[model samples]
Target: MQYKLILDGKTLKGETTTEAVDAATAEKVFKQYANDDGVDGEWTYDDATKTFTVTE
Candidate 1:
């Protein structure tokens, strides 16, 4: 199975498999970018669930 990041109302695509990695690794990458972009809200990743939720 692959992984994905689910944003507010948009589902970031195309980079699904390319960005596919373990939850821990994904969080590291996510946090780095999240900080760089000044994310508007909270971000969390679920391991087995394989879902990235961006919450307000």
Candidate 2:
């Protein structure tokens, strides 16, 4: 599956990227880069394509 972090918002705008096997996994990895202060982000699972996108 294709999973990655799409840059958005001030915290993650062109900063880091993320990918995972599950929502929890996605969140876990994203949490690292997003740990900066109080960032906002989540994971999007495209079941139709079985892919994911890290949202911020």
Candidate 3:
């Protein structure tokens, strides 16, 4: 199954499991936002562990 982790500009406070899929593919998404950071007063990634932040 595919695991999803969501970060809302703050600390790690979101996660879920999606449809069955490859684990590596999931990791790739997480890696995409390893450097979550931007705009003050807004929670963001701290380039730490697995965290997902959406902005667009």
Candidate 4:
């Protein structure tokens, strides 16, 4: 799976294994954003593209 996070014109992208496809895995990834000082707002998931987008 691929996760893409974009915020304030800057973007962070990552790729995970198929095991990271459930709510638990998503939460783990989201938590990383929450802990990141650079992240301004909540992060979102795109099921269609399997990506995460963060916006302030």
Candidate 5:
């Protein structure tokens, strides 16, 4: 699966392929990157927006 990460006025994208795994693992990996300082951006998973927002 491919995940989009927007941080610090730049976009860092990543992909991972895992077989026989659950949604928990995928969510964990996504959160890991989202919180990483290297990314360095404000993040929001707003239910109202229904999208992830990143601001540098």
Candidate 6:
């Protein structure tokens, strides 16, 4: 499956369009933003849209 990463760290909010998979792909790809330090937000995946969002 494909996952579109949508991130909002207050200072910046951007997207990867559709650049995420699963354990079959690279590790930490999602965490690159979801787990970033000093970033203000939590990650949420939308099954309806197949997208991920980091909302503050």
What is candidate 2's lDDT per residue for 1-56, written digit by digit as tens?
33455445555465344445665676566566556545576656565654444455
Which pairs of residues clash in candidate 1, taking residues 3 or more apart in a chain or in different chains? none
Rank ordering of all candidates by TM-score, starting from the highest: 6, 1, 4, 2, 5, 3
Collision pairs in model 4: none
Looking at model 5, how many pairs of residues clash? 0
Per-residue lDDT of model 6, residues 1-56, tens digit only: 66776777777678765454662242256665456645567767777777777777
Taking the candidates one at a time, how many backbone clashes does each contain?
0, 0, 4, 0, 0, 0
The RMSD of every model to the true structure, in order and in angstroms, is 4.3, 4.0, 8.2, 4.3, 5.7, 3.4
* Candidate 5 CA-lDDT value: 0.47
Query: Highest lDDT, which number?
Result: 6
Candidate 5, 25-51: lDDT as tens digits: 544565565567455566654434233
* lDDT (Cα, tens digit) per residue for candidate 1, span 1-56: 46566555233322222264567777666556545555556777677777676644
Give the 10-residue window scoring lowest on summed lDDT in candidate 6: 18-27
Off by over 4 Å in 1: 9-20, 47-49
* Model 3 steric clash total: 4
**True-vs-predicted CA distance for residue 49, candidate 4, Å:** 0.4
Candidates arranged by lDDT, highest first: 6, 1, 4, 2, 5, 3
Which residue pairs clash within candidate 6? none
In candidate 5, which residue ranges exceed 4 Å CA deviation?
1-8, 11-28, 35-37
Per-residue lDDT, model 1, residue 36, is 58
Clashing pairs in 3: 9-43, 9-44, 10-43, 36-45
TM-scores, all models, native as reference: 0.51, 0.41, 0.32, 0.48, 0.33, 0.59
Global Cα lDDT for candidate 3: 0.44
